[PDB]
């Protein structure tokens, strides 16, 4: 007698032809290479923040001799802060028996994991290292991009030499420094930093198979066809999901209060673009034999270098004139 929402009214919904029904006798991989899906959106969008992990950065060890050892993992602190304290420990500035007129130093340094280095910001790409080689012209600049990949070990050994006091005692000190790319040192009788290889599975947030079925609830379902892969969960269907945001009890309402909050969230996302990790992208191969994309055989040398006489069709073979089809099956 008045407007009551119906319950069981939905018509059939037209089913479209599948690519097998429409294009048999052709490459299956067409309808099986699915669309790309960038993961990095999701963790930002649907709110995954990695737990703050706080691993070790450096370490100081003594022996019954006078000799002390200073150990560093360059993947955990920045480069400069690692290099300041080296020059502060390599001398003995923490050792209260410090005379700068000493011909002898019982302080030794070790470094490890020099491949991966922390550089806060957009500095691994822009900053450079310059020098001159006696001859005219000269003035060779080089990028961190060269060191951080090919030989990153001059860099750590080059920045130390700039913080140390400019004198003759330097070489004796820098003779007592050692760097490694791997996660080890070869010395024996000393410890080694454990690497952090794990990566947080965020699976508990977007997967029922991780949780137990009795803790969960179904609030909505489309079909009368119920999956067998989902069995044991209740069905307490809300009357509330399908209601748009006007027909509900609580409405989010733009207002001087929430708009004031809106602007706080807006600065947050601008205030975070600054705290973003940039990476040296690697060089690239363009072998057509590897990619899933199409390509061109513009020239002849692209054949020999890649052995593409196969996928090229011979010239001694007929052609295809017109491939229209009138009737589309169902």
């Amino acid at each position: 007698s008045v407007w009551k929402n119906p319950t069981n009214y939905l018509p059939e919904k037209a089913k479209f032809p599948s690519p097998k029904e429409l294009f048999p006798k052709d490459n299956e991989n067409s309808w099986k290479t699915l669309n790309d899906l960038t993961p990095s959106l999701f963790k930002d969008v649907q709110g995954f923040k990695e737990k703050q992990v706080q691993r070790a950065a450096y370490m100081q060890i003594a022996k019954p001799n006078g000799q002390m050892y200073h150990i560093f993992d360059a993947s955990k602190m920045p480069l400069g802060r690692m290099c300041q304290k080296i020059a502060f420990f390599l001398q003995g500035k923490h050792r209260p028996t410090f005379k700068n007129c000493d011909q002898v130093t019982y302080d030794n340094i070790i470094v490890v994991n020099a491949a991966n280095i922390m550089l806060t910001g957009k500095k691994a790409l822009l900053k450079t290292v310059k020098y001159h080689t006696g001859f005219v012209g000269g003035l060779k600049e080089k990028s961190y991009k060269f060191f951080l990949t090919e030989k990153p070990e001059q860099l750590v050994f080059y920045c130390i030499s700039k913080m140390l006091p400019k004198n003759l005692k330097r070489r004796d000190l820098l003779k007592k420094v050692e760097i490694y790319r791997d996660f080890q040192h070869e010395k024996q009788g000393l410890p080694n930093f454990v690497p952090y290889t794990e990566k947080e599975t965020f699976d508990q947030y977007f997967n029922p198979f991780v949780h137990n079925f009795e803790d969960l609830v179904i609030k909505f379902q489309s079909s009368k066809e119920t999956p067998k892969e989902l069995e044991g969960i209740k069905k307490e269907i809300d009357p509330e999901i399908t209601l748009p945001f006007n027909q509900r009890s609580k409405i989010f309402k733009l207002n001087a209060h929430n708009r004031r909050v809106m602007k706080q969230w807006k600065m947050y996302y601008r205030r975070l673009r600054r705290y973003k990790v940039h990476k040296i992208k690697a060089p690239k191969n363009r072998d057509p034999n590897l990619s899933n994309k199409s390509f061109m055989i513009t020239s002849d040398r692209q054949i020999k270098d890649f052995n593409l006489h196969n996928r090229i069709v011979p010239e001694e073979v007929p052609e295809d004139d017109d491939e229209i089809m009138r009737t589309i099956p169902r």
Partner: protein
């Protein structure tokens, strides 16, 4: 300035109390003590903290190194060869229906609770 940071105060707040305090001692001797007579240095360091009502504390990015081993941050011996880099755990769930029962068991059983 380096013998006093083992006791987790810096130089400035040390002598700040030393002049507040009743003690007359010079910077000369306090050097000679910390090298040659170190026990008496920590003695002198204590009342100076106390007559000024000063309270030391360590820097909060320090660990009792035994605790560092226990948390598997660090090992004394040699390391192992690292495994092949595992594929990145995706933020989304995906697969084919035909293998769900095989996939259910792995996720259910291992992390049931």
């Amino acid at each position: 300035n380096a013998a006093v940071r083992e006791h987790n105060t810096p130089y400035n707040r040390f002598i700040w109390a030393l002049n507040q305090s009743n003690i007359i001692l010079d910077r000369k001797i306090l050097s000679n003590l910390a090298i040659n007579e170190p026990f008496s240095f920590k003695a002198v360091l204590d009342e100076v903290r106390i007559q000024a009502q000063l309270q030391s504390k360590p820097h909060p990015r320090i660990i009792n190194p035994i605790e560092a081993y226990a948390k598997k941050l660090i090992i004394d011996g040699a390391l192992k060869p690292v495994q092949t880099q595992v594929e990145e755990p995706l933020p989304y769930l995906f697969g084919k229906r035909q293998n769900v029962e095989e996939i259910k068991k792995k996720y259910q059983a291992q992390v049931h609770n």
